Amino acid sequence: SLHPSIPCPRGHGAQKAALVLLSACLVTLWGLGEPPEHTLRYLVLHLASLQLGLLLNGVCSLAEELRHIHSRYRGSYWRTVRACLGCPLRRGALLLLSIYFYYSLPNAVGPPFTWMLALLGLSQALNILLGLKGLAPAEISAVCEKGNFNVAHGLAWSYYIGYLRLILPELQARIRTYNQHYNNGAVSQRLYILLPLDCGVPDNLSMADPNIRFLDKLPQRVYSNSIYELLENGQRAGTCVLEYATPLQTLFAMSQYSQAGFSREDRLEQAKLFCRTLEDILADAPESQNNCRLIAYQEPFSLSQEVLRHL
Amino acid sequence: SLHPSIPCPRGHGAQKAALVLLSACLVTLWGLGEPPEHTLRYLVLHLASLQLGLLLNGVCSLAEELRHIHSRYRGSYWRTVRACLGCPLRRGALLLLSIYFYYSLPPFTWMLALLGLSQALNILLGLKGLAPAEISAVCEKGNFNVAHGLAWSYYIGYLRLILPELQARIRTYNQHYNNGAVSQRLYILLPLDCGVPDNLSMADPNIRFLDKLPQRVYSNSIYELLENGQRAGTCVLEYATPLQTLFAMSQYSQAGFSREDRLEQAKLFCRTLEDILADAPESQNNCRLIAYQEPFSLSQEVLRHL
Amino acid sequence: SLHPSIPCPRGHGAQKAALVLLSACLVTLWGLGEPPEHTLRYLVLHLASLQLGLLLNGVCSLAEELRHIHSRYRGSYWRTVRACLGCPLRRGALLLLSIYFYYSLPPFTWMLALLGLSQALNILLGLKGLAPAEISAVCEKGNFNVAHGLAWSYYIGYLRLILPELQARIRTYNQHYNNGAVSQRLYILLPLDCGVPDNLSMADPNIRFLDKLPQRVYSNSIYELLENGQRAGTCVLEYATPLQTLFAMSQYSQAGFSREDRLEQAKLFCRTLEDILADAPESQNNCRLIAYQEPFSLSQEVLRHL
Amino acid sequence: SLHPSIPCPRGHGAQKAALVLLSACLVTLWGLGEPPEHTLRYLVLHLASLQLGLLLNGVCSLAEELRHIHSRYRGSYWRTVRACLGCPLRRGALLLLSIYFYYSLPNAVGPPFTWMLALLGLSQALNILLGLKGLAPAEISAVCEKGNFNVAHGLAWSYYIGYLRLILPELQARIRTYNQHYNNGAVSQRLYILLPLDCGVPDNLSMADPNIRFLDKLPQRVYSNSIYELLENGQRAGTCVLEYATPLQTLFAMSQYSQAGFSREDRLEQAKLFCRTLEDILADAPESQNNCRLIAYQEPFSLSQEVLRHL
Amino acid sequence: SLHPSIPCPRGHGAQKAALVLLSACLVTLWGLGEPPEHTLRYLVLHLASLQLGLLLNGVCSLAEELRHIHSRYRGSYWRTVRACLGCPLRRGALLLLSIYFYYSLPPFTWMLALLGLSQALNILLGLKGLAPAEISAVCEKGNFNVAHGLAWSYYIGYLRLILPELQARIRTYNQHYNNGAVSQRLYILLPLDCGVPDNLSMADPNIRFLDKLPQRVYSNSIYELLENGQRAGTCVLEYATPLQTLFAMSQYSQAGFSREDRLEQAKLFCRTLEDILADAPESQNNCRLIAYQEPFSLSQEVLRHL
Ligand SMILES: CCn1nc(C)cc1C(=O)Nc1nc2cc(C(N)=O)cc(OC)c2n1C/C=C/Cn1c(NC(=O)c2cc(C)nn2CC)nc2cc(C(N)=O)cc(OCCCN3CCOCC3)c21
Ligand SMILES: CCn1nc(C)cc1C(=O)Nc1nc2cc(C(N)=O)cc(OC)c2n1C/C=C/Cn1c(NC(=O)c2cc(C)nn2CC)nc2cc(C(N)=O)cc(OCCCN3CCOCC3)c21
Ligand SMILES: CC1(C)C(=O)N(Cc2c(F)cccc2Cl)c2cc(C(=O)NCc3c(F)cc(F)cc3F)ccc21
Ligand SMILES: CC1(C)C(=O)N(Cc2c(F)cccc2Cl)c2cc(C(=O)NCc3c(F)cc(F)cc3F)ccc21
């Protein structure tokens, strides 16, 4: 909600679509009136074949993982087996069910047991070699945003743990001291962290818009926060402690280099994700309680207008 | 390499396994000896079913992304369809070819309904789950890991700004004071357990603080290294704060960052910091990384690198 | 009564629902008018199958606790069997009667093997899930809560030691001072959001710190109760520290305790603390519990109870 | 590990036994060689009946949870439905599967759809009213321990957050200062916390055993901690900051009161669980960086011997 | 956008031309409707002949690089074979498959000898020469250009080191100058004709040299911009010395750098310099590129950008 261009967390729309598709398929099956015994047997055989294919792919992965057991898996074999096949005992039970219900049940549509196993191994080898069973970017994004497999996650958490959680307490006291000592307008008691989505972070904040102009270094493990006054049609509508977000600058510098594999599309994606994650952390932090305000913006507009409307 | 516990980049053992499995499958198919027209039809049907399942999964993902199209994909349907279904042209051609072969190769709509029901059950319950090893491999290949971002930010923000002047400051200190020669390399420690005391001396009594390097300010601390009570050497010891941040991430509940994930990302962070510092112009053998896993004397490990 | 958003203890709505379901079942069996012998035979068979499934689940539980027998049950097999199978004599008699009826009522070993397989599948995959509402009801009934312990500790540890002396010290401060006299009741605030600032001024500027009560010392404070900028009274304001403890528990990842559970336990803590203080011999209406949920004027809410 | 009587966390042995039983059942089925389609159909129908019974139980639970919607569920029906029927879409899909399979598949042993529904409703009503489906205490304890549904966990976390986390940092400095002043042996730099499993906590630690005697009050929120010395055959072999665990005292007081429903067997179980939870928290917490040691004991034995052996 | 004569990056017009050609071929095949077996056999034979010709060309290339194996490829035969034969596995499989079709489809040795002779004549006389358009496309695809190196060196050596301090020096001179403030940007001139005078006075009398910026001895210059004989502003004009380097390169005979190539590389240099400066962190709109070619008024062109 910081900016309309920042994505929201993934919902359960896929589950709802799956439920609707299941209902439609059930309605079609009831309408056609085909025998249900064949339907159940074929569905069980299909699921058994899928489980056996997953087993074969997991074994193929285990073949390479066995050389990583000493380093990535603390020298334990059951850990590697679980990482290759998911839950060990549940998958084993599913495999036993597959074996029992394929070696016994009739197979009108499907190969015989050992011939089916050979053909399925051939198909799995073809999938591994040619990469047919790949992951579309939607699934990769969902996995990344579910298990927190990102770089924006790391950058935002580092920003909170290292810088914000350290200056948020003393910020109010220092602002109050500056207001009391110097009787020359008023200063808002919240640091406004700017979040340029396009990751364009100049070293000089005043160059973003001439209205934002530096006024004074806020008096004081040595944090220097330059305060800026906001000119509205040439008149100072107020002043505030304003600064950029350095993780966005590090994201941009990551995109510049060639040892990152981090392109402009990925840079913008991570900028949006970092802004959202920092919003979450600051919303649910004890230090950030009417203390700091995030101002996310994408240049298509003047910065002073948004800073003032948030003021 | 950096440490025996640090996982080396993934090898091609999966390709060797695929080759072995392909050889075994060819051997057994030749042994059984059945006409290949039936095999071809069955395999084409299998790929057709797999492609139809992928299409249904993409349809569900499209229904999910209908509410994120305007923000994630700049409000363009082409990007959303490509994200949910892979490459548009390639996947579309593959699905069309599979459908044509499926219709040509000898119930017609009943099979489609059964396949749709099976895919809906797979998506809802989650039978075809992604194994943790596959997820880790994909994330590492695509640089979708937290440690990569943390290490790159560490290099860009702190290392790149102090390494050029570290040698100059060390030389100034050496020409300003003597015995006691400080090493010209920043010995960055990488404790894989991620338990970092706020002071080196607290972590190990064999390590003593000596002085502070001359200096935004960048204060560095030169430490005394002890052995049997005698000073063996002095180096600019400095913990890698990204590991402390990983530990704090694992502490909080909002991160969803488990201890096993913490150790794995510590290993990845050390490895990618090695990779970054290997080719970094600012790194000219003036910064040596030390990785140690307590099952230990830290001072002995530091000296072994001297 | 304490707050509209605090859940009252569960009544017997499930009993009414069961009665309605039983009445509907009687109505529908009367409507069909099926012979009762077959109905009874099938009901007994279903109950025997459920008993056998419970027996197999208890066998699996006993296999699990065979290694815990030394600690959980002090090396006693009888207690282990009772824990894994409920009442020993009653469950044993019920299982024996069910087996006898199943043998008498008209495959036998095939059905037993299939029932064992079904129970193994239920235990492995986890089809027989537990409803979260049922889990919450069981926890509330059997005191398997966290807020229960939190509130009992807060009452026993702190309230029980200050409530007798709070009125005496309030009176001492009243006679020491002059005319609005401080209220002789403790207005313990209970912010259900669990976000407690260290100072009341930060929570609400209209509330101001005024003085400290005279004294193993409890430094209870006396605050200015400003309405429209004028002091309408004086009393002792004191946050509930178990709320801060629950907040810190929700913050950490080593608690298995989420924000939804945090609000749930704040509700339960307020409810059971009020229940304890209602019957507390030390409490003689000398401490008034004030609770609120932020959607708010704190000073006006406090003045309402004044 | 602290004491042989403290129960270890539940392992996956239950699933191991389940897999063993499944293998035995599969072997038995293969030996009998009954028509596999009959077995699969019967299993599907049994699972459908179980799902329908769970649906009826969830509906009955909702019938009482709906009156708590305004307070316990923040006034939302979706929350109540989710809390009564588990995951909404997954449970709905399972229910639709059960309905479709029962309405279509033949059943040699099984009532017709409406008559089966009536009989299952009667059985569910009987189970609810009479409590026939009695939850054995072992599974109740397993669920409570898995989901942190025990007062011991809350008391341990409160003990850590309120008291230990505020004194453990400065404890080392205070002990070092006291050692600097009074050179009259040396005091251990680790706080020892006594855990009486019998929940018998006297007000004075000295009266617990003659060999333990209070020496001096450690100089400093008043965190006055009394140091105690150990009389090994009349000699002060060691001295340390020793005190009881007040959560165990509160547990004993709870057991004394009749308004807690907190019996003696439950008191012992909760004492053990509190000890183990505090062990875990101190093991992983940063403040307890080899700063505190827990001495858990149960009187069937001298306390001083255990304290010395831990020293 | 920098200049009308600056070429845009190569598009995909050839893809559209191929689409039109394919459409015409499909239309004529549908119109004629000749049997497809002969068409397939002829096309397969033609493709196999093309593959065999490429194989023979690669064999000759390998015979050439048998002496460069130890210099260009560090003494590894596999890299040399890949260089002379494209992707090893893909092209090897293509050649094997083409051979398999060629043998399967029905003299044979005479055809192979004739194909070898045709390849020998193609290589010796260079019939399959690379048109300059294809060479330019490959160079712009793989970034094989003199302009690329020149612009990258200009950015990394000069612009990246003077863009930051230029604005500070300009601000100092602005709060040092009594009388029109100088612009805060570097107005780099990019004369596409590459005829650069040693001074701006010779370029146009309407532009006057005024002063030297305070100072690495970069020592930029500030000029007077005369409009109608009166000063309209002052900017830090500064030629692009890589253009002079390109001109001097074209002058000499050892460069192999004709005037056409000189103009092409000047245009490419300007385009890639703009591309680099667009994403350059040091560029904060403090350096405005100016390009101009006489079919001209330099002073008016500079005033337009103000
Ligand atoms: C960013 C690189 N990085 N990635 C990861 C992962 C870890 C690190 C890392 O190690 N950084 C770091 N370590 C230092 C140690 C010393 C020293 N003397 O030892 C000196 C340094 O440079 C001053 C140090 N720096 C760089 C600057 C750091 C701290 N800092 C930040 N941080 C971030 O923005 C940020 C981005 C991301 C992502 N995560 N974070 C949080 C860390 N913003 C600041 C704004 C102001 C201002 N407005 O004035 C002043 C600051 O510094 C004053 C505090 C100095 N204290 C710091 C700790 O205690 C000793 C010295 C600010
Ligand atoms: C809270 C953590 N925790 N969870 C469980 C379970 C057990 C404990 C625990 O161990 N607590 C504890 N033990 C101590 C021992 C010493 C010592 N020197 O030995 C010193 C301490 O700190 C001063 C001790 N503390 C913390 C302070 C505690 C008592 N106290 C509380 N109570 C709670 O908040 C609370 C929350 C929940 C839930 N349950 N409770 C009841 C305990 N509110 C207070 C408000 C004031 C004020 N502003 O006026 C002053 C207080 O105490 C001043 C000194 C009184 N003391 C002196 C020593 O004897 C005991 C009494 C207050
Ligand atoms: C839903 C439905 C009816 C369906 O559409 N298919 C696709 C399909 C084929 F794959 C193959 C042939 C026909 C159809 Cl029609 C399917 C498959 C099975 C099954 O058991 N496949 C086992 C199996 C193979 F068939 C080939 C193989 F190489 C390995 C393997 F392990 C069950 C039900 C279905
Ligand atoms: C696994 C297997 C073979 C099994 O062991 N039983 C136990 C059992 C009975 F319950 C009932 C009779 C015999 C057996 Cl033998 C079972 C039941 C069904 C079934 O459909 N039960 C519907 C159903 C009822 F019959 C009575 C009722 F009150 C509600 C109800 F919902 C399917 C498969 C099995």
Residue numbers in the entry:
A (entry chain I), D (entry chain K): 5 to 188, 192 to 227, 238 to 317, 323 to 333
B (entry chain J), C (entry chain L), E (entry chain F): 5 to 110, 116 to 188, 192 to 227, 238 to 317, 323 to 333
Give the original sentences from the paper that presented this experimental model.
STING plays essential roles coordinating innate immune responses to processes that range from pathogenic infection to genomic instability. Its adaptor function is activated by cyclic dinucleotide (CDN) secondary messengers originating from self (2’3’-cGAMP) or bacterial sources (3’3’-CDNs). Different classes of CDNs possess distinct binding modes, stabilizing STING’s ligand-binding domain (LBD) in either a closed or open conformation. Here, we explore the conformational and oligomeric states of full-length human STING in the presence of closed-LBD (SR-717) and open-LBD (diABZI-3) non-nucleotide agonists, lending insight into potentially distinct modes of activation.
In the second class, we found a bilayer of STING molecules devoid of curvature. Using 3D classification, we parsed out two distinct conformations from this class. In the second conformation (the apart conformation), there are six fully resolved STING molecules. On one side, two STING molecules form a dimeric unit with an interface like that of the together conformation. On the opposing side, the central STING molecules still interact via the α2–α3 loop in the LBD, but the TMDs are splayed apart and instead interact with their other lateral neighbors. To maintain this linear arrangement, dimeric units of STING are intermittently separated by breaks in TMD interactions as seen in the apart structure. The related cluster 1 was slightly less rounded at 21.2°, and the four adjacent copies from the apart conformation displayed nearly no curvature, with a measured angle of 2.6°. The constraints from the trans interactions produce a potentially inhibited double-layered assembly consisting of particles from the apart and together conformations. Further comparison of the autoinhibited head-to-head interface with that of the diABZI-3 structures reveals that it buries nearly twice as much solvent-accessible surface area with an average of 1258 Å2 compared to 664 Å2 for the together state and 589 Å2 for the apart state. The average distance between the α1 helices, as defined by the distance between the Cα atom of H185, in the together and apart conformations is 42.3 Å, which is roughly 10 Å shorter than in apo STING and 6 Å longer than the SR-717 complex.
